[PDB]
Amino acid sequence: ASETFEFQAEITQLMSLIINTVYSNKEIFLRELISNASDALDKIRYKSLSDPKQLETEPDLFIRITPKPEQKVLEIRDSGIGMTKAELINNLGTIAKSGTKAFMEALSAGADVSMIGQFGVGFYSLFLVADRVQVISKSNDDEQYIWESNAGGSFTVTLDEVNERIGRGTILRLFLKDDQLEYLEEKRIKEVIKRHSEFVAYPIQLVVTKEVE
Amino acid sequence: ASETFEFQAEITQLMSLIINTVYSNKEIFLRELISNASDALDKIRYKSLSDPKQLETEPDLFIRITPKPEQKVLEIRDSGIGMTKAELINNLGTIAKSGTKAFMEALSAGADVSMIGQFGVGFYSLFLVADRVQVISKSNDDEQYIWESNAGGSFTVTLDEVNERIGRGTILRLFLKDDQLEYLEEKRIKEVIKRHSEFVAYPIQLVVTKEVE
């Protein structure tokens, strides 16, 4: 039973504007999500400093990008701290985010959309290339949950009984817009990663599916 | 709630012997599973001849091999006909298989274990390299189920609420033995596939996870 929640008004505004913007450097969404993933891993790593057990649900700290061309889906996974149901609701929607309005104001002023991450709202940059997103998260402190949004004013959080078990972490499953399917390509993903994510403490793995010759 | 079933006695015997055999051409397990996958795809393709809708749950007919080194798991997936709960119980255990005893008798006589497929029991060749297997299957006619076996006399079939949704088909999730982790390697998998699966009507995709340079 998927629970539905309302996005804080400003977040909804931000999403509508992001998903509708003509911005030409949409690739920054990946830098933003890799950065977030990186942050999630930092959290779990730091947390595990005084609670090593926290790493055992998924010993490997990594960021994995998995293109699912057939579904026009791009997944960015991290074995970071993950988010509990409450955290998904809290962090990804209902709670007013510090910079949401500020960033939008910045944008109005001419700020580059790539500044989104500095306003703490980079997560939403995903709507630059996706019109729908499922944040599948497994926090050590909770079951696996699916937070899903289509940039609309409400999002759902559903106990995850349909996706692969995340030992711990988050999978941002991006349902790419039809004109952004370039991010399903290994070469493209590869170049975007090297361009904006040169300094990431965690291995960034790209899952490539190739037909055996 | 996982349901437990007893393997037909001979299948249990076959598994014990296979999982315990010293055979040196264990790679044939892949040829056997790819062949089975191929057969599953043949089924769905043929079935869809008079019921096209049957393909819509997963339009792409493919065999996908996904090494999961971190879990010492090798998955062989096909978007074939899949198996319903009843079929998993029926086909993979409780029902006496035509050649099980025959093959074992053949083996006793000196027959090469690679003959397993000609006795219709090639599926079990997986125990050559795995000590545990989960057959996650999604048939159009049923929910996604997990059939699991550790070569013991009983297997379980559990409604799948923990694995990725298979549009349609089967994932043979092999928990490789510690000395057969070579099948997690792309080069190895690649060579085994080309050696024994030269004539497969379906694309055989290898999912490789590579850390972005």
Curated annotation (Swiss-Prot), chains A, B:
Changing residue 106 to N: Induces a 6-fold increase in ATPase activity. It comes from the Eukaryota. It is found in: Cytoplasm. Keywords: ATP-binding, Chaperone, Cytoplasm, Nucleotide-binding, Phosphoprotein, Repeat, Stress response. The keyword RNA-binding does not apply. GO terms for molecular function: ATP binding; ATP hydrolysis activity; ATP-dependent protein folding chaperone; identical protein binding; unfolded protein binding. Its main location: cytoplasm. ATP binds at residues 32, 36, 78, 83, 91, 97-99, 118-123, 170. Induction: Expressed constitutively and induced by high temperatures dependent on transcription factor HSF1. According to PubMed:2674684, it is constitutively expressed at low levels, however, due to the specificity of the antibody, this result is unsure. The keyword NADP does not apply. Changing residue 82 to D: Abolishes ATPase activity. One of its GO terms (cellular component) is cytoplasm. Homodimer. Interacts with the co-chaperones AHA1, CDC37, CNS1, CPR6, CPR7, HCH1, SBA1, SSE1 and STI1. CNS1, CPR6, CPR7 and STI1. Interacts directly with the substrates GCN2, HAP1 and STE11. Molecular chaperone that promotes the maturation, structural maintenance and proper regulation of specific target proteins involved in cell cycle control and signal transduction. Undergoes a functional cycle that is linked to its ATPase activity. The nucleotide-free form of the dimer is found in an open conformation in which the N-termini are not dimerized and the complex is ready for client protein binding. Present with 444943 molecules/cell in log phase SD medium. The TPR repeat-binding motif mediates interaction with TPR repeat-containing proteins like the co-chaperones AHA1, CDC37, CNS1, CPR6, CPR7, HCH1, SBA1, SSE1 and STI1. CNS1, CPR6, CPR7 and STI1. Belongs to the heat shock protein 90 family. This is ATP-dependent molecular chaperone HSP82. It comes from Saccharomyces cerevisiae (strain ATCC 204508 / S288c) (Baker's yeast). The lineage of its organism: Eukaryota, Fungi, Dikarya, Ascomycota, Saccharomycotina.
